[PDB]
Design a protein around this ligand. Structure first.
Ligand SMILES: Cc1nc(NC(=O)N2CCC[C@H]2C(N)=O)sc1-c1ccnc(C(C)(C)C(F)(F)F)c1
Lengths: 977, 276
């Protein structure tokens, strides 16, 4: 039902009618019988030796070797098809289309890029892809199995003492379901086994009760497999069941019935892989860094409003100037030409390897007294050293970036380097002094020798300890820095002091740095939590960032690496070059563990709309999708699935943002009913959790939530055979319009908090549900079943402050009633401390919702810290507690005198313990926030914002003062509400 | 005679967070300085913030046994004595690598005098007037930004659609080349023996091809017109925001300055936010 035109190879044109779902084969076959009735049909050949071709919406000259595709999937720009002789590697071309569809941009684009760094990365990374792909295949089919279904274990074999007490003598009652009856008949056994038994013993003991091993244990319902030889209590599923006291269900499956599903995956080195004097060391040059500013191609400023403009430059080294900034004379707005040799005081031999050049175009307003009003118009940094250790020289042109709105500063040392890919933006021509040859940064061989040329117990070990234990953002005074550096040789004995000892080094003097290099080369290894701090924007040196990764590789466990994935993705943007040790580490991990890979991909993919990092992430995504293996087909199915949602959601915003909800719901049901959409939204793994797989969509349950953005409620039947044991449905909110990056960080922090509390001994049960941002202001939210918002309960139970208590008592009445109230208290305590430390505000009766077993959890975080106090300045910061009459009534079992009930005091005491517990681990929470500075979250742009945490935790004060400071907060809000 | 009270000193700023010191010492000449209470809040420390080399060097003042100094041999009787001494003596004596003098103190009065009409009644009206302007400006600024960002998307989509038009035009042109080379003379012309196939078949096909190529070429030109008009409008929105933004910055400073020195210090009120 679509008119198309086919350009036969005999210089003919044929008009033809096609079915929008018609495949290429049917159309190619149908076409030729039409060609016989045209003047030059004799030169035609058979169907074979011919393939179609067209232009896609992405404007790609793509030849469709894989004829099985149909018209709708084609995404043709216009309905025209050309027929030519297939040329090239058919299998290679088919893969390239698969990769391009997943990463959202044609792979041919990276072929066009002429930058030698981009091309070297494309072919140099591949040796990483090969090693991972070979490693997964070291021991088949076993090794290939762990990659696809990696053990979901925890890093600590030994149970917390508080949870070891939930096992009678450490015995676990595990139910085992064996499904061997041909008529899908399920058998269940009950086992009592030690917590430390390896899964094979569980299998070994399981058979005897029924009366290598040939069998593997699967989690009944969600397809997670117990493959590796770990204590059965270490697996996250088994550990969780203990905590919740539920009965753990497992099923026995034959290894053959699993190895069969694992399809052999071949990684072929792509085509581009096969495709393809006088040097002066930096230290020999003797001069001062001088840079010439020639002209600016065009600036978008108004002559009447702006008096003059100038270019402001500085030699930054990871956020701190290496010397005084410099300015260019103020030239008139209408004519932006300078041609001036800006001159800096940084001697060339003293330029640090990670030195940069931050510059901007600022407009001077003045025009009133002597109050200059400066407002930058553009910015852009450039590394002074080539990715090959070469100092830029000769002329250059740079396209500047729009100023990050909300940034009042006149330079952006934290922004990404390189030109603006767009060409219709202010271009500033530079010109770097030419030193008669190529200047390379000295190699480590010379640097170490230089340090040796220029190079006693102490009683003040307390001062070193005192500093080393301080906050990452704590004030560091000049006397201390001089103290730290003077005692650098004795700082090894406190290895976690390195982050402080690095700041005390003056990076603008090659005698200092050469000595810090000879010292970092022997630093005792450090905990991965501390090494992650050496990767944010404050530490740009390659040898410092190289040390941090070596710590990550040999101490970061796959569980922790999964928890800190969002942060580790962000600190990729702080890498000045495309080929760095961190990316090789991260990719090596993503290619040996599909769980990491799934979130590695989705984190990069969600940030492809951002042109600052679109290129470097796009190249990374390509290298991954090339070697991910058979997973690429699963990812493509997810990607195609989300796109149908985005398009459908958009139609309900720009087209149906006014009519009634019933019309919207009726319109939505029709749109879901169409088979084209119907097949895309079924039978794919859930992006939130790959281990869950979504079956048939339930049209009767999917509905348009009536919230602010009107998100989308989707119900998927679990296709697993033993779905009944675990949840029998997946319900997911698809949100298009609200940024979800804050919630991911908020929910990631809550999960980290609860982990710390558990280890301490406080069973404060948080509920950090699943949230994932897939694209730009679009994401997925997991739904927690059998839970209601406080507003729903009051409205449903309608008023009185006891309405919440009455509802909670009814849901579980009897001896259990004690268990509920305890869970309400433990949960409510955890969230009061968490919503205060992070300054989450606006908490009301619609983003506080409570399960039926009494547990309470917060939803709809969005803004954190006090962004709402930054915009509309409210002088002093901080927020009060939300403990309301309702929560107090429930906590004290409905006693009329809520404030000083006996059980209330245990509530306050456990709030204190929680507050102190997080405070002792404030280093970690500071590093997590700092690594997210460049993410572009409006609430988190500078160390000014992270300083808010340093208040709520009262980091500056002492432990006693902090606790007493906290108690003041609780009392104030307690009787204040 | 020159050792007055630290409280009445014009550079000692009292209790201010490390953050507050930073905005005041922003883009200032080497030698800008000020003094404030230590972050620990244990009175008797008085950290010194000195701007040198584009950095905010942060020096500490020790107060053992009722004396003061930077190093252990405390040899000063008060901060004002210490600050005054280094307002004419270079710090190189203290540190060889800190060759500066305390040149441009950040006077608390010098900037505080910027605000006027200390009477609270006038401040309440004056503050409300600035807030209404500031809120209107921010509302107006946001309107342009969303349009500016939204118009950026339309430009990018339009630009790519042009490239797709380039490919389609290029593809068709190559076919016209092959058709004329192959079927124009080799087959039909050699078959020029009274057959009407060339007259009807070949000619009808070729003309249909030409009308198709031209039509595509025409659509590309019409698209380029929209891009050109959109690109110019895209630049114009940039100018409006580039002028609105600097103005909006000044209002923020002024509104805050009144609140700091009139609505909070002069008269502490919970009514502060009621004026707005
Ligand atoms: C975790 C979760 N669970 C919900 N609903 C149920 O759990 N149930 C359980 C039964 C039916 C339904 C109910 N409220 O009776 S909503 C929800 C959630 C999580 C995060 N943000 C939101 C909103 C409202 C801000 C958004 F984004 F959806 F608009 C909702």
């Amino acid at each position: 039902r679509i008119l198309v035109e086919c350009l036969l190879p005999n210089g003919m044109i044929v008009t033809l009618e096609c079915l929008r779902e018609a495949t290429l084969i049917t159309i190619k076959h149908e076409l030729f019988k039409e060609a016989r009735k045209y003047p030059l049909h004799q030169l035609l050949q058979d169907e074979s030796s011919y393939i179609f071709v067209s232009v896609t919406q992405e404007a790609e000259r793509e030849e469709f070797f894989d004829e099985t595709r149909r018209l709708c999937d084609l995404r043709l720009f216009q309905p025209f098809l050309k027929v030519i002789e297939p040329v090239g590697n058919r299998e290679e071309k088919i893969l390239n289309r698969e990769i391009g569809f997943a990463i959202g941009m044609p792979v041919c684009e990276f072929d066009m890029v002429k930058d030698p760094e981009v091309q070297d990365f494309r072919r140099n990374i591949l040796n990483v892809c090969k090693e991972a792909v070979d490693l997964r295949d070291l021991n088949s089919p076993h090794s290939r199995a762990m990659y696809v279904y990696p053990p979901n274990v925890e890093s600590s074999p030994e149970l917390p003492k508080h949870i070891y007490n939930k096992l009678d003598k450490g015995q676990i009652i595990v139910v085992i379901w064996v499904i061997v009856s041909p008529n899908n008949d399920k058998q269940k056994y009950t086992l009592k086994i030690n917590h430390d038994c390896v899964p094979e013993q569980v299998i070994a003991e399981a058979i005897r009760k029924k009366t290598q091993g040939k069998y593997i244990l699967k989690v009944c319902g969600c397809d997670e497999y117990f493959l590796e030889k770990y204590p059965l209590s270490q697996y996250k599923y088994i550990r969780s069941c203990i905590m919740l006291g539920r009965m753990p269900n497992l099923m026995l499956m034959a290894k053959e019935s699993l190895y069969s599903q694992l399809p052999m995956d071949c990684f072929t080195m792509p085509s581009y892989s096969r495709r393809i004097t006088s040097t002066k060391s930096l230290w020999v040059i003797n001069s001062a860094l001088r840079i010439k500013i020639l002209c600016a191609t065009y600036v978008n400023v108004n002559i009447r409003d702006i008096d003059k403009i100038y270019v402001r430059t500085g030699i930054y080294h990871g956020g701190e100037p290496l010397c005084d900034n410099v300015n260019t004379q103020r030239v008139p707005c209408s004519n932006p030409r300078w041609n001036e040799w800006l001159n800096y005081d940084i001697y060339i031999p003293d330029l640090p390897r990670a030195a940069r050049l931050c510059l901007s175009i600022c407009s001077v307003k003045g025009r009133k007294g002597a109050k200059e009003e400066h407002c930058p118009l553009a910015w852009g940094n450039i590394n002074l050293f080539d990715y090959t250790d070469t100092l830029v020289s000769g002329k250059m042109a740079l396209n500047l970036w729009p100023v990050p709105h909300g940034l009042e500063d006149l330079l952006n040392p934290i922004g990404v380097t390189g030109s603006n890919p767009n060409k219709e933006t202010p271009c500033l021509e530079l010109e770097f002094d030419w030193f008669s040859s190529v200047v390379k940064f000295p190699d480590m061989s010379v640097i170490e020798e230089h340090a040796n040329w220029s190079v006693l117990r102490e009683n003040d070990k307390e001062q070193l300890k005192a500093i080393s234990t301080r906050d990452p953002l704590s004030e560091i005074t000049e006397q201390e820095k001089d103290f730290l550096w003077s005692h650098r040789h004795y700082c090894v004995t406190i290895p976690e002091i390195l982050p402080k000892l690095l700041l005390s080094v003056k990076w603008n003097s090659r005698d200092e740095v050469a000595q810090m290099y000879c010292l970092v080369k022997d630093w005792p290894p450090i905990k991965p939590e501390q090494a992650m701090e050496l990767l944010d924007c404050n530490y740009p040196d390659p040898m410092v960032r190289g040390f941090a990764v070596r710590c990550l590789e040999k101490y970061l466990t796959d569980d922790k690496l999964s928890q800190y994935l969002i942060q580790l993705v962000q600190v990729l943007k702080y890498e000045q070059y495309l080929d760095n040790l961190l990316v090789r580490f991260l990719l090596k991990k993503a290619l040996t563990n599909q769980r990491i890979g799934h979130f590695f991909f989705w984190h990069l993919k969600s940030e492809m709309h951002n042109k600052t990092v679109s290129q470097r992430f796009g190249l990374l995504l390509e290298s991954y999708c090339r070697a991910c293996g058979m997973y690429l087909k699963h990812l493509n199915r997810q990607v195609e699935a989300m796109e149908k949602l985005i398009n459908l959601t958009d139609i309900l915003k720009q087209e149906k943002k006014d009519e009634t909800q019933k019309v919207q719901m009726k319109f939505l049901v029709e749109q879901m009913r169409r088979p084209d959409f119907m097949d895309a939204l079924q039978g794919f793994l859930s992006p939130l959790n790959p281990a869950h797989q979504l079956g048939n969509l339930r049209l009767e349950e999917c509905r348009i939530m009536s919230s602010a953005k009107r998100p989308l409620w989707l119900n998927w039947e679990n296709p697993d055979i033993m779905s009944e044991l675990l949840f029998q449905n997946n319900e997911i909110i698809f949100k298009n319009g609200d940024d979800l990056r804050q919630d991911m960080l908020t929910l990631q922090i809550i999960r980290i908090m609860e982990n710390i509390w558990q280890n301490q001994g406080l069973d404060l049960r948080m509920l950090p549900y699943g949230c994932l941002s897939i694209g730009d202001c679009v994401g997925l939210i997991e739904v927690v079943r059998n839970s209601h918002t406080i507003m729903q309960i009051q409205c449903k139970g309608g008023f009185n402050s006891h309405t919440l208590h009455q509802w909670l008592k009814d849901k579980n009445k009897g001896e259990i009633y004690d268990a509920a109230i305890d869970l309400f208290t433990r949960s409510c305590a955890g969230y009061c401390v968490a919503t205060f430390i992070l300054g989450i505000g606006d908490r009301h009766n619609s983003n506080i919702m409570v399960k039926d077993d009494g547990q309470l959890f917060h939803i709809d975080f969005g803004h954190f810290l006090d962004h709402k106090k930054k915009k509309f300045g409210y002088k002093r910061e901080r927020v009060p507690f939300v403990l309301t009459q309702d929560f107090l009534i429930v906590i004290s079992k409905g006693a009329q005198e809520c404030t000083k009930t006996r059980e209330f005091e245990r509530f306050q005491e456990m709030c204190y313990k929680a507050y102190l517990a997080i405070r002792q681990h404030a280093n970690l929470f500071i590093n997590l926030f700092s690594m997210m500075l460049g993410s572009g979250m409006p609430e988190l742009q500078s160390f000014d914002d992270i300083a808010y945490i340093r208040k709520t935790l009262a980091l500056d004060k002492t432990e006693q003062e902090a606790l007493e400071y906290f108690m003041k907060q609780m009392n104030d809000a307690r009787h204040g509400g | 005679n020159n050792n007055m009270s630290l409280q009445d000193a014009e550079w000692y700023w009292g209790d201010i967070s490390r953050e507050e010191v930073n905005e005041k010492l922003r883009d200032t000449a080497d030698g800008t300085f000020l003094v404030r209470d230590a972050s620990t809040k244990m009175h008797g420390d008085y950290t010194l913030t000195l701007r040198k080399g584009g950095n905010n060097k942060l020096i500490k003042i020790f107060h053992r046994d009722g004396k003061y100094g930077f190093s252990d041999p405390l040899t000063f009787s008060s901060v004002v004595e210490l600050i005054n001494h280094y307002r004419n003596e270079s710090l190189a004596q203290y540190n060889p690598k800190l060759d500066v003098k305390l040149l441009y103190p950040v006077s608390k009065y010098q900037q505080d005098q910027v605000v006027k009409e200390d009477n609270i009644e006038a401040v309440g009206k004056k503050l409300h007037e600035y807030n209404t302007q500031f809120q209107e400006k921010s509302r107006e600024y946001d309107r342009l930004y969303e349009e500016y960002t939204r118009t950026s998307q339309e430009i990018q989509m339009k630009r790519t659609a042009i490239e797709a038009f380039n490919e389609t035009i290029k593809i068709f042109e190559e076919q016209c080349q092959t058709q004329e080379r192959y079927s124009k003379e080799y087959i039909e012309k050699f078959k020029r023996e009274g057959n009407e196939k060339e007259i009807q078949r070949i000619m009808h096909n070729y003309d249909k091809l030409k009308s198709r190529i031209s039509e595509i070429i025409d659509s590309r030109r019409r698209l380029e017109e929209d891009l050109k008009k959109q690109a110019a409008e895209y630049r114009e929105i940039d100018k409006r925001m580039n002028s609105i933004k600097p103005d909006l910055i000044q209002l923020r400073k002024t509104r805050d300055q009144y609140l700091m020195w009139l609505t909070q210090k002069g008269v502490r009120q919970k009514k502060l936010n009621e004026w707005l």
